Amino acid sequence: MKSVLFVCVGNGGKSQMAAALAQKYASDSVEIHSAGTKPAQGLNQLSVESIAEVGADMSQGIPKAIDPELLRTVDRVVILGDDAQVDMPESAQGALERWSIEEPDAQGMERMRIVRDQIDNRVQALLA
């Protein structure tokens, strides 16, 4: 697992968080990307703050569309949550994953930290 594209719908929240957490743990030998099937107008600032709280940074992140050459060539395409849909091309050299996110009975920052911590667990597992 030497390259990963994290994907969700807007590329403002979970996928940026996953990308920020992965960078925080990964060696330089791992290329880390994030993208959205429908890129948002900007970042989820709650996501931004949740990431800042654990000493990572996604504040420089930019919501962006899925690059077909990245999609085709990364080792892992990881969809966060239930909504985003990605159909791996036949030529794809990598494999598709989907991580479910258990919605907490909370809102705002309390909720976002719970989301972050779930993503954290998975990203550490992914890089292991």
What distance in Å separates the CA atoms of residue 19 and residue 7, rounded to the nearest whole number? 9
Phi, psi of 102 (to 5 degrees): -75, 120
**What's the Cα-to-Cα distance from 110 to each of 46, 47, 106, rounded to whole Å?**
10, 11, 6
Experimental determination approach used: X-ray
Residue 119 host element (H or E): helix 108-126
Beta bridge partners of 97: 78
What distance in Å separates the CA atoms of residue 122 and residue 118, rounded to the nearest whole number? 7
- The CA-based angle 35-41-42, given to 5 degrees, is 75
CATH class of 1-128: alpha beta
Helix (H, G, I), strand (E, B) or coil at 32: strand
**Residue 118 CB contacts under 8 Å (≥ 6 apart), including other chains:** 101, 102
Q: What is the strand order of the sheet 95-99 is part of? A: 31-36, 3-8, 76-80, 95-99
**Can you give the C-alpha Rg of the chain in angstroms?**
14
Q: Following DSSP, what letter does each residue of 9-46 receive, concatenated?
A: SSSSSHHHHHHHHHHHH--TTSEEEEEESS--SS--HH
DSSP code at position 29: T
What distance in Å separates the CA atoms of residue 71 and residue 3, rounded to the nearest whole number? 10
Q: Which amino acid is at 97?
A: E
Residue that has been written with the tokens 């989907």 in this structure = 98
Q: Do 56 and 120 touch, CB atoms closer than 8 A?
A: no
What distance in Å separates the CA atoms of residue 49 and residue 104, rounded to the nearest whole number? 18
Other C-beta atoms lying within 10 Å of the C-beta of residue 72: 15
Q: Which among 2, 12, 1 has a CA at the least distance from the CA of 81? A: 12
Beta bridge partners of 78: 6, 97
Delimit the domains of the chain by residue range: 1-128
